[PDB]
Ligand binder design. Structure first.
Ligand SMILES: CC(=O)c1cc(-c2cccc3nccn23)c2cc(N3CCOCC3)ccn12
Ligand SMILES: CC(=O)c1cc(-c2cccc3nccn23)c2cc(N3CCOCC3)ccn12
Lengths: 113, 113
């Protein structure tokens, strides 16, 4: 493993801790969600993200954050605001952007010296 | 080696990065996957594709792509959608369609002036 894979595994672990039930842990199949595939064209979930970390597909924290955002944006588009899925997506999104803020990453860069 | 062999080795290396465990590295046999030769008439894998590049058997990207798509198609026919092998095939197929799209190859041709 590389140091960047470890850092991303850390962020992913901390995010998934906020989805106890695993709503975001696996892909959304049409069996689970009728016609999902008709609405959401670029699906994403935590499991796909872990596989990309293992394949060493992320060049940057920015790329990881873009997948994370896409996953949350999907959930807030497929699901109405009054759902558990929409509300948790929104909570998750904010937590992730605090965790991986420019300010947090600058302070981490300084500690890499 | 020749320029086309070098371009194909490049595309192959980038595709193989998507399969870090090497599930697509070697041929599927009936000893590995029950009843494979019944469903799949023309097996293909990354090892075979590498051997064909080295032997200079591919005359065009189209010919190379055809093997890549065959490999993915085989896995998406034999395996159920809920399997690692299906999901990975779909992942490889998407990467390859992006990398070797008509528009990408156009851009490459333009740079060969
Ligand atoms: C992220 C997301 O949008 C999502 C996740 C589920 C879901 C719910 C339960 C298990 C599960 N595994 C993978 C996804 N899920 C899920 C389930 C939805 N349903 C839609 C209505 O039918 C009942 C379940 C709608 C949306 N979702
Ligand atoms: C590409 C593909 O369809 C594939 C690859 C494997 C596989 C799995 C493990 C070792 C291996 N060596 C060569 C191929 N493999 C493999 C194994 C399969 N099995 C499914 C049934 O359980 C026994 C193994 C089903 C499909 N596959």
């Amino acid at each position: 493993s590389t140091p960047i894979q470890q850092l991303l595994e850390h962020f992913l672990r901390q995010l998934q801790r906020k989805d106890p039930h695993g709503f975001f842990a696996f892909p959304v199949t049409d069996a689970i969600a009728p016609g999902y595939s008709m609405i959401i064209k670029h699906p994403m979930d935590f499991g796909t993200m872990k596989d990309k970390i293992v394949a060493n597909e992320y060049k940057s924290v920015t790329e990881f954050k873009a997948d994370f955002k896409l996953m949350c944006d999907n959930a807030m588009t497929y699901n109405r605001p009054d759902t558990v899925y929409y509300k948790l997506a929104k909570k998750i999104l904010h937590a992730g952007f605090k965790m991986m803020s420019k300010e947090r990453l600058l302070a981490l860069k300084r500690s890499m010296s």
